Amino acid sequence: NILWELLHNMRDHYNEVLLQRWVHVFREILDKEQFLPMVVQNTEEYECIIERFPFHSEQLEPKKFPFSRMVPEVYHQAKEFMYACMKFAEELTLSPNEVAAMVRKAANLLLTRSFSGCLSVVFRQPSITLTQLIQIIIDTQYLEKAGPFLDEFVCHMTNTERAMFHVARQDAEKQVGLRICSKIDEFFELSAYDWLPGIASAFITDMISYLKSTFDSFAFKLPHIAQAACRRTFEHIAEKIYSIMYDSTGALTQINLDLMQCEFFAASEPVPGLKEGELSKYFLRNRQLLDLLILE
């Protein structure tokens, strides 16, 4: 059916125009504001935000709003889209409940698919630092919480009676882990075991500091994602160390001091909410092998 395939293409195109529009607001916010939380001290700005995006107030005094400019911008764009659709559906002479039904479904499918496609494309970017990614994750949570006002908008506009920006708590973890793991891989590039005190390798120690300092920055905000990235973090460290042994007494006791540092770390509660030797078991096999290596 040529007419059906034609409708299909129009939809794919519309989705594409939306997806590429979402991507454009992301590049801009990364370039102009480096994806940082919106901070302001001037009512003629605070409300300038409160009006563009429905957010439960505060009164007190960087770091102001929990979210970056992407949130109001995206919310606004979704709103303009819904408006367009109702206006258009009304021209096709549909009744108010038919416009509210149409819009609510066609719009929440297009916005949902197109924003999802955007997120997918933006996570693939190296320009996106780990801090910015966490920002994007919480940003989408605030948009998620604004979902209701959007539905009300349709109800009000049409004078009608009563998972769009969601980020898979699973793809968020993968994206977070990859960055934490690649950063981990860089520290391991500073390993010189085949070369030349009873202390740990400076790279293990700095990695641990970076890890402690990285987990603290977003664990209180994204607890479950943090707990997840942490499990993946230690798993990956466990494998980098194993890969090391897989390739001169003084060097054998350097790997030992390095694994101990990682073992202490695992046993120090880097992130609240796994608490019992969960992280530690990632190093058992390595500790067993190492010990079996030292007995030679």
Side-chain angles (χ1 to χ4, degrees), residues 1-55 57-173 175-296:
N1 199 289
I2 286 64
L3 292 179
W4 172 61
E5 312 296 40
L6 174 57
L7 292 158
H8 268 299
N9 298 163
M10 303 194 121
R11 186 182 52 66
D12 290 358
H13 179 216
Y14 211 93
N15 185 82
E16 201 55 18
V17 182
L18 278 174
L19 185 155
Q20 278 164 52
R21 177 55 185 186
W22 292 142
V23 163
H24 177 284
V25 331
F26 275 63
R27 175 102 270 157
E28 288 202 307
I29 290 175
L30 182 63
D31 293 6
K32 298 196 180 189
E33 294 187 50
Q34 302 69 54
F35 261 97
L36 289 170
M38 298 187 290
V39 181
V40 162
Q41 182 53 298
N42 188 303
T43 303
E44 270 172 350
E45 315 186 19
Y46 179 80
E47 294 194 3
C48 178
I49 298 303
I50 290 292
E51 281 154 46
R52 193 179 189 68
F53 180 70
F55 182 57
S57 65
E58 193 64 313
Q59 328 153 301
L60 295 182
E61 325 112 52
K63 333 146 193 168
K64 210 80 177 188
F65 266 117
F67 48 75
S68 94
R69 188 140 316 198
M70 176 270 259
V71 176
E73 214 131 308
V74 169
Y75 183 83
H76 174 68
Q77 187 70 62
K79 193 109 103 59
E80 285 313 325
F81 177 59
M82 316 254 236
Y83 189 88
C85 298
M86 296 180 269
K87 211 74 186 190
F88 184 63
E90 281 159 27
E91 288 177 353
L92 306 182
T93 55
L94 301 183
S95 66
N97 315 77
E98 290 176 343
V99 171
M102 174 87 261
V103 174
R104 217 197 310 276
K105 288 176 181 174
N108 298 177
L109 206 82
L110 266 162
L111 292 173
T112 294
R113 184 200 180 197
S114 68
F115 191 74
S116 200
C118 179
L119 288 179
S120 183
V121 191
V122 186
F123 294 155
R124 284 173 182 170
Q125 310 189 316
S127 308
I128 303 302
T129 184
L130 172 59
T131 296
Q132 292 162 168
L133 200 177
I134 273 70
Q135 187 60 65
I136 293 167
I137 310 293
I138 96 180
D139 266 19
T140 60
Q141 289 205 303
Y142 271 103
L143 276 163
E144 218 167 58
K145 301 175 188 180
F149 304 95
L150 230 36
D151 215 289
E152 281 173 48
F153 178 65
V154 187
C155 283
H156 295 156
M157 203 189 147
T158 55
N159 189 210
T160 251
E161 193 55 273
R162 297 193 175 188
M164 185 179 287
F165 306 97
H166 188 288
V167 175
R169 63 76 191 174
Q170 208 150 71
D171 198 47
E173 308 180 336
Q175 239 47 60
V176 178
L178 265 77
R179 292 172 169 61
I180 294 183
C181 288
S182 88
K183 182 62 177 170
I184 286 172
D185 295 324
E186 293 173 51
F187 282 103
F188 271 94
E189 286 184 47
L190 294 173
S191 59
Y193 293 115
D194 289 345
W195 309 71
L196 185 81
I199 212 193
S201 298
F203 81 88
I204 283 295
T205 281
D206 300 327
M207 172 189 54
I208 295 172
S209 300
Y210 158 81
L211 254 14
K212 286 181 179 176
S213 182
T214 288
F215 282 145
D216 294 337
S217 66
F218 75 93
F220 71 82
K221 291 183 289 191
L222 284 354
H224 303 308
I225 290 180
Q227 286 162 29
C230 188
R231 294 195 242 280
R232 175 60 190 131
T233 294
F234 283 75
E235 183 190 81
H236 188 52
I237 293 179
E239 56 197 13
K240 297 290 298 180
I241 277 174
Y242 175 54
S243 298
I244 290 182
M245 297 182 283
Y246 179 56
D247 304 354
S248 61
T249 300
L252 210 51
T253 67
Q254 186 58 47
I255 291 162
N256 185 233
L257 298 159
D258 291 351
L259 179 55
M260 289 195 285
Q261 288 296 115
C262 299
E263 291 178 322
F264 278 116
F265 190 36
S268 68
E269 295 187 301
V271 306
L274 350 156
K275 299 189 180 180
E276 284 300 37
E278 179 181 1
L279 299 189
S280 300
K281 104 282 188 173
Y282 292 108
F283 291 121
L284 287 171
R285 62 172 177 191
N286 280 3
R287 171 50 60 188
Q288 283 167 161
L289 175 62
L290 211 218
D291 281 350
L292 262 287
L293 265 294
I294 296 171
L295 288 187
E296 270 133 55

